[PDB]
Amino acid sequence: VVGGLVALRGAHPYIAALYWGHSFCAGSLIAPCWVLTAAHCLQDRPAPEDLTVVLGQERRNHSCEPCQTLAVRSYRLHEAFSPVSYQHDLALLRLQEDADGSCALLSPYVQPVCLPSGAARPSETTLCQVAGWGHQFEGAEEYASFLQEAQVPFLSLERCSAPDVHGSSILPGMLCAGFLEGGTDACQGDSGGPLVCEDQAAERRLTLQGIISWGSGCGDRNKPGVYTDVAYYLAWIREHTVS
């Protein structure tokens, strides 16, 4: 994340860290046994046994005291996902339950994030938070150690699909957030991570409305980050989550 600061330990209980082989991705706990991430992180289709999910983590790849490590029972990429356009860039991870039949062991540092309403009409007005362990700048040598978070405004599709910004590239199922003047954005290694935005309707007032997907550069002017519109896939999430 560029233009962001370190996030406090209790700030992000829903964020998930995904490890396998030499790769890394983030994700969001949407239910005690379910993690929502980006499909392009798994386009290589690595075996589930290889996969490791760590919840309640603050420092990337560091063991910690409320850290919980879980195996992945199975995962599902969206059927219509394109590795070229990154359309439908979302995937479900089914966590492996233990002997007690529990997956995630909920605590103040490990909690699921509320799914979005979707029925609400989002103005540019909506403010969001983006989080990740990715690069802090485009040229950055290494991923961040501490979790970085940044405040970004939601951006309308009509403005987004504009020629000046992203133009034709934006497709249904996609949403944008950030400042056209740039400065604050998601960055490579942030993929799969959460975009939590304000929902005044909701009782929790904050819902997962985006999955970090793609973009051009970090924080470049007129090039806001592109996310998967979680609200667009509620039926799909309901359908395969229920499994």
Partner: peptide
């Protein structure tokens, strides 16, 4: 206490 609803208010 208990869990807090994710439902719209």
């Amino acid at each position: 206490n208990g869990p807090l609803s994710c439902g719209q208010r």
